[PDB]
Design a protein around this ligand. Structure first.
Ligand SMILES: *Cc1c(COP(=O)(O)O)cnc(C)c1O
Ligand SMILES: *Cc1c(COP(=O)(O)O)cnc(C)c1O
Ligand SMILES: *Cc1c(COP(=O)(O)O)cnc(C)c1O
Ligand SMILES: *Cc1c(COP(=O)(O)O)cnc(C)c1O
Ligand SMILES: [K+]
Ligand SMILES: [K+]
Ligand SMILES: [K+]
Ligand SMILES: [K+]
Ligand code: NA
Ligand code: NA
Ligand code: NA
Ligand code: NA
Lengths: 431, 431, 431, 431
């Protein structure tokens, strides 16, 4: 049983609680799109873990690579360069758009946004950072000051120069320009305000191409390009946080490739590591040169470590070969349609959005009002669990609960159909 | 050759420079206390990498464990608990002193200090943090605001409420109380000042038991206990950053055990991971409970991940069995004496300090003045390299260059004697 | 002549420039609504000085009072109370609405807003302050952080916790709610954003009932009451800055009396002093009691000084007797109409707004586009001068230049008609 | 009686408490060195009011001048220059040292320090301000962030970049350099620390030549010059706050003239106004030019107002004619000696310091320990009152209560002898 009293005793006595609530099970092993409990039950992992397992759990090539390296090159002094590092840096240069030339290899998402935010502050001579009101950029210092979806209260002042603008949200429009939702005008109206407050030190803007924690909010058409232009006018850098979207999840290698807007700094994380702690930042040579002349510094224990770099190169090689970016569009199309059918069946589904294999289902009480469904989400989530489907719901202010669905890039037709059912049943038995 | 033009071309073109200067070699493989270049040359690794490889490179048990796990349990959703996590948490509870009960498993040193600093801010209701003028706590936001040894300039304002006090340094005393160096009085004098500046919101004090980057500065006797009392009086928490000192390097499991002062939050990193990205914070149940009632949050992609937790448990198991904590004292005594002999021979060595296998050699021009040796360090470091000894020198203001010597806990008598020689030769041929 | 070379020499050599550009004349004397140059020319003072001379220059009762006091009670130690102080405090209590009980007598507008902002921070336990994007609250520290109409750049960071919301502006509507300008919805949209950014420490909101420097922007109907409710919900205090509006200028003793919304702290200045340095804050007893228990402190050299208090009491007595609050409505109606006639005549006048004797004329290129008239303002202002009419124009972003017209409360029918002409001529000869 | 129940009723009901405790009397009139209660009792004013009445209360020339002006030129629009302004500016240029050329005429002490601090931030491009741990610079925003003697707690964060260094205090030495009190070394030790914390943005240092609220702490010999050099090295400006010391009180026109160190910005206040609200800043042309090119701005209602400027010119004229700067040394010598005699008589007097007519008496329990006398000060102060001597005691941490004695510059031999007695009696009857 998952009920092993010694286990839970020790857990209750020695673990720090950091948010949420531990599942009431013991994960014993994991493989492909499934995780298995102490009882041998296979739970279908529809969130790819913590939105990371782009290649699934324990992908045989990841295992080879981790193996080749643990016994050969593990961790090195920060000034010692090696092969996997130089190859990963390079690979990244070639697969990101033009204009993205040099990489810094680190360990976490928040660490990568810190490094980006510090380089922009260095390069510009400024310190103010603007982000979206419903962003998620990490728990550490600066990443936390640019995060607005959560954790902002009770922990002291934020970093100086922190401002936020609303994210453009089509589902629940709030800004109107003559009859309709004018997200560009919203943008201008927003920027006017910032301009009115700035102390004359705007350094950068960080944005998620698709707000994940913010409820899978997709940046509408022509927004990014407009955003980029707002930054250009002001002398600000644009940092794109592609932690959940980079590496094929939305159907392109990087989401920034859909819009066609290439950022000043691009940050990668979750999917680059496929489960491991690897992260990076990619920038243009000009900025890097500049940052170097000014003495940029971001030295950590694990920057440029052989093992991680090596794992990342493989994730990339596999995605490349198996044409997983394309599978994301195909399987993504399959999941989407299924969800819409569900929508046809239940009034509680108010919206289905996202791209590729990064989809969102907004639970609502009724479509007319679009009134948030108070705790019906928790029900559905409870019911999914019982049936063996691992989901995750985010819930924000003035929004309905949103299920973040993000299966592995290697999901099969069957696994998709399967979750689609479980989902159906869980919903069915929760009204 | 290490000279492979394609390699260096790609490196010059696609790597971001983050501080220092890349060694002019290609590390092809690593094992035990040595790293090997593209030419097969074995460089003796006297800094344990980035001060982490407590068990050396590619320690066969680390390899087993990484192996058992990559193919079994890799990364899980942040709410899903597993075995290696619960066992590591527990193990940590039992080997740290009494008073240290609950752990949070993360990825980097800076991340662990961020989590600690955020919990103290939460728990106290305050935000001011005090640290030493020559500290090193990491590159991320808050860890960076409490770091004073470097990177403070040109990147924007620091976090509000940041203060620093001088660290007690015996080698170059600066505060005098009737005839001698009264470090306690220095402490009081320092705190008076802080008190005079505080806005009434002192939340915590972070300290390294031994300032590593600050030039291997050991906290003198009775200091910590006095420090702890200064915190107690003010309602402040004491966070001990044992990233370089924890896990046997100084001859005790944790340095805080020598002083006998147990901190409010203890942070672990480099040596806990032995090369990998694993980190943690250990706190008392009272604080944790408190932090939980107030809604503490520190949710990341890799908190509680099976693989890392698993590696850490092994590091711990090995240290435990092989009695490496004791070896650190024995081999440490051997290295020390050797260094002192060197001191006898060359006037440039002005001081040898540290504990266990975390030693420091301060290069000076002459002992009488104790005048810093301008670039003689770089010479010695250059010469070490040529001979195959990997050293690292830190250089701060009003200090001479300090060699940080921190070999693996598994070093052999021979390897120690060996580096000791190379060191001798490198010094000899650099005057 | 105004051309006295010794004068201008000394002026060029020994005066610090603090903004704007000195008039090219020497004011030799002043009386009623006029100022006189070195040549004896009478310039009609349509701005009441620096918007202060509510009773005109050198009003014979002010002269008596200053006289009675200079030779009797001038300045006292801050703990020594006297009669004029206690009477002024009292008078203020009785003429401000219910709910406004205790006063603090100081010297400047900015000083009064500082005292208000510090009391709210004290009382709430919080520090964030919200103001309008086009406010003016003074040059000193906190008053400056809540000022957004100007001086925000090149002087260092602002105070932490500073946010601004747009002011509701009817002339150039920007927020639309189904067809029309929904200023209340603008308000809600604004507050949502603040809420999304606040670190959980909103302490107060300062607002001008009529934004003077912001171009005589009147807070639309039902706004204040809605504003007050936004503050109430959040636990924030509402500080009303009635420096230019208090003391009868808009037709009521205090503008807050029109809306019927009484603030938490009310601040007075310019018009209270009628030219002298007197200022005050009026609050409720509850807040004051609270502030006292917590140790509120605002001790200055001139708090509670006999002379100033005494002058203020008289301003108040005169306004009261001569029924100047009513004259403000009557003469104000006369000036208004005249301005509208002007509007009929010249296309450049795009809007005429304000209340009582606090009017604004927005110069524009053409009414259809409402395109700002680039420097036509400076022309008109130049031409006014030549004719002997002293005006003042404020010019902000995305706005046309605005003439701030605010004659004395004691203006005569003739003086009004007169300026109205000069204005006509100045405009006429500047296209 | 002073007991008028209507008075006290109204006072209890309508005055805001801003610190301290109101005297239990009604000041009805004031003249020369005395104030008179409702009963006709003459209290000898030994603090010159709020340390301002350099020429006493109601000095007949001040009365003339206030009179000539109230009826002639009172308040003008901020861009309109006049005679008294230009003459005062000039006079200030000529009587301050060389190197001090241009003046800005304002209203309060804190306002003047705000203007100074903003100009330095403008001129340098930096924002960090350093002050003494026991300073007093005013209640407003920035003046308050540089104040450390009081009001720092419970009101929110201070301005970013605020640091403080200890003031050199001879009476209770704390820093020792080989045997003795090395205040210069203290200074260096202090600055090292600042340097270690600065984010690379040190803009200025504000200092009081004699810390008044800090307990009449005189800056020891050669300190200022050393201080100035510390600023020069770092590119920082030195702002001297001569609010209590300027205008002859210490025996020179400005205290900065004793040391011979001329500051970058000099600020004047209390004594410049002699009781009225007048204040100024004097700077060098270079800085002013610079500040002008960069758009410096400090526009208030009362900057450059005719009346105040005019009063100030007279204070200055009188000081000049009557040779009051010299009287300050002579009468100051008389008061001093008297105090020392007192010291001879009572063990409670532990120290007598200061300069000219700005003296301090530190009450202590016994000279050997120099143990602060707990509330014996309040006794003495109570007893003085009863006898008709108005004193003021400041009390700080780790210090004994300090009586600030600062009679008018026009005190007579008799009045001095008189207070000296009352003081004797009050002390006598309070042990
Ligand atoms: C998860 C996430 C991060 C932070 O990564 P961590 O490894 O959890 O620190 C940053 N940005 C985005 C957009 C993320 O989704
Ligand atoms: C190395 C180090 C850290 C930071 O760890 P990283 O993994 O480099 O972020 C923090 N504290 C101390 C004392 C360290 O030595
Ligand atoms: C003028 C003004 C002030 C500042 O008064 P000063 O005496 O110039 O410091 C503050 N608030 C408002 C609304 C003002 O118009
Ligand atoms: C009194 C004082 C001030 C402030 O003057 P206020 O008019 O009270 O604002 C500033 N600095 C010093 C040194 C003072 O003594
Ligand atoms: K490394
Ligand atoms: K996890
Ligand atoms: K006073
Ligand atoms: K003026
Ligand atoms: Na690229
Ligand atoms: Na323990
Ligand atoms: Na009232
Ligand atoms: Na001069």
């Amino acid at each position: 049983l998952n009920d092993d009293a010694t286990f839970w005793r020790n857990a209750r006595h020695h673990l720090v609680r950091y948010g949420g609530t531990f599942e009431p099970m013991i994960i014993e092993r994991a493989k492909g799109s499934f995780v298995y409990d102490a009882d041998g039950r296979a739970i279908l992992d529809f969130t790819s873990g913590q939105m990371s397992a782009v290649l699934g759990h324990c992908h045989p090539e990841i295992v080879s690579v981790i193996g080749e390296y643990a016994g050969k090159l593990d961790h090195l002094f920060s000034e010692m360069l090696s092969r996997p590092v130089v190859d990963l840096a390079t690979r990244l240069a070639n697969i990101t758009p033009p204009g993205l030339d040099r990489a810094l290899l680190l360990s976490t998402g928040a660490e990568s946004n810190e490094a980006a935010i510090r380089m922009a502050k260095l390069v510009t001579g400024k310190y103010e950072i603007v982000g979206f009101a419903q962003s998620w950029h990490g728990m550490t210092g600066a990443a936390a000051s640019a995060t607005y979806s959560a954790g902002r209260k009770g922990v002291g002042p934020a970093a100086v120069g922190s401002f936020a603008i609303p994210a453009p949200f089509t589902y629940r429009p709030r800004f109107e320009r003559n009859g309709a939702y004018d997200y560009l005008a919203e943008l201008d109206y927003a920027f006017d305000l910032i301009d009115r407050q700035s102390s004359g030190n705007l350094a950068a803007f960080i944005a998620e191409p698709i707000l994940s924690s913010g409820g899978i909010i997709e940046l509408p058409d022509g927004y990014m390009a407009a955003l980029k232009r707002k930054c250009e006018a002001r002398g600000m850098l644009l940092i794109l946080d592609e932690a959940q979207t980079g590496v094929g999840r939305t159907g392109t290698m990087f989401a920034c490739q859909r819009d066609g807007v290439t950022p000043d700094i691009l940050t990668l994380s979750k999917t680059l590591g496929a489960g491991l702690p690897l992260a990076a930042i990619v920038t243009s040579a000009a900025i890097e040169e500049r940052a170097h002349e000014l003495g940029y510094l971001f030295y950590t224990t694990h920057v440029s470590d052989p093992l991680p770099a090596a794992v990342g190169l493989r994730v990339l090689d596999v995605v490349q070969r198996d044409g997983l970016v394309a599978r994301a569009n195909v399987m993504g199309d399959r999941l989407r349609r299924g969800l819409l059918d569900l929508m046809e069946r239940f009034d509680c589904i108010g919206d289905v959005r996202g791209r590729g294999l990064l989809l969102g289902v907004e639970i609502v009480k009724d479509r007319r009002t679009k009134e948030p469904a108070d705790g019906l989400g928790a029900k559905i989530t409870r019911e999914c669990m019982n049936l063996g489907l691992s989901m995750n719901i985010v819930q924000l202010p003035g929004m309905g609960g949103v299920f973040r669905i993000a299966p592995p890039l290697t999901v099969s037709e069957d696994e998709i159909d399967l979750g689609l059912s479980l989902l159906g049943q869980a919903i069915e038995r929760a009204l």
